[PDB]
Design a binder for these strands. Sequence first.
RNA 1: CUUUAAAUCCUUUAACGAGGAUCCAUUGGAGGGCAAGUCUGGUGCCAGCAGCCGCGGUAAUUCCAGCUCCAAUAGCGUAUA
RNA 2: AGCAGAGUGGCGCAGCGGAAGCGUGCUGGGCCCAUAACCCAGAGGUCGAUGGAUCGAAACCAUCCUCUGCUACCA
Lengths: 144, 57, 99
Amino acid sequence: KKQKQEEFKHIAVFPCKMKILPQYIFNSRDPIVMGVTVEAGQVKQGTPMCVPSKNFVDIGIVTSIEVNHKQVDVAKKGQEVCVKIEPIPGESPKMFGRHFEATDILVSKISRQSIDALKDWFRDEMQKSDWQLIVELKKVFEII
Amino acid sequence: HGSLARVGKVRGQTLKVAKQEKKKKRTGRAKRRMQYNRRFVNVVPTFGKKKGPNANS
Amino acid sequence: RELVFKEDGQEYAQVIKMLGNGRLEAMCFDGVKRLCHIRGKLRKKVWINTSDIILVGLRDYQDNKADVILKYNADEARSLKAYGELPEHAKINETDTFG
RNA sequence: CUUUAAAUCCUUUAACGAGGAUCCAUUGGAGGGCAAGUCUGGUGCCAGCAGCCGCGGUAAUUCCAGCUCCAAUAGCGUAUA
RNA sequence: AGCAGAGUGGCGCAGCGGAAGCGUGCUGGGCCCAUAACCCAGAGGUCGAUGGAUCGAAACCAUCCUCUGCUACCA
């Protein structure tokens, strides 16, 4: 079971719904660090995100989460965290003020193989509210 | 129609008609006697071409 | 001509790649991919383009390769959309014949 | 009764033992090769048949069933050297 | 948190005074058995906006807006 966890950690992601706080912005670019509050979902380290309202733009993945000087890998609903977003290699980096603002909503860049791997194996670790969020992201991301 | 990957549609939709009771067929030596009689004994001379033993046209 | 409905063992599909050798791949309504192998009565008389609603049967022993049954025109496709047999996620993206 | 170390079986021999003599013969096949229905109903390039040509497209002499018929007969079909 | 580069037809570009074009794309017709070539045409422009030195500004000057690339500074 833990061998399958270490095998399937990098290709299976968790649903996520991040709302960025105004004025709690702690970097500009590379890494893109700010303090965000978990509106919904559970965040996993290494999960990529994409903004739906700005024509499906990807900013990066998670490298470290700091919750009041604590290294907390997975955060639950309603906990204020600080994430350290590092952009993907090869693509151009993103900075504040022109691609994203302080009023957008961040959600995890989920993929069809990741819903398939969550339903095939991770069903015992899946909650109904996060499954509803997964259905919502399937309705949002043009995922048929 | 239902589906295409279903198997035995023709066998599962065949109008099942049971066999009817018939008299038993002679076997062993008497069948050769009846075949010899019906093929060489009570035949009429015929012109043209000879019809088969099942030509029900 | 007539409004054919589905049955237990068949579903609808949308073409992703129009491929050769008499085969293609189309999604289901939930996104599972079934390798569509075209029916023998639909090889030359009708022509299947890309991103159109079709009728594709399923298999009761495996999930690796499916078969196409029928095709629908654009007006009956948006009429079937107006009834609501599919969720509010799929968009036809204006496919029809030219003039 | 006989056989046989002792039996069993064969043969001999009692008393019983058939008229739809139910004490009921299967295995393959019926387009050509290759002997034998352009018979009747069902599916409609689907299900399937077919060693080879090929047969199936809502009138199938080849699929699935009933009747008839052909082959060898207590035997017949199939896969391999 | 501040800068650099660019804004012309759907896309991109040539580009400076007596002047809205090209390459590609769209529509109709002919030609052909039909299509692609070929021919005949047509549609599509606030030269990103504002004001000035200007008889003539898309052009020169100042501001703003939009898009793309930049310095390291963090719970």
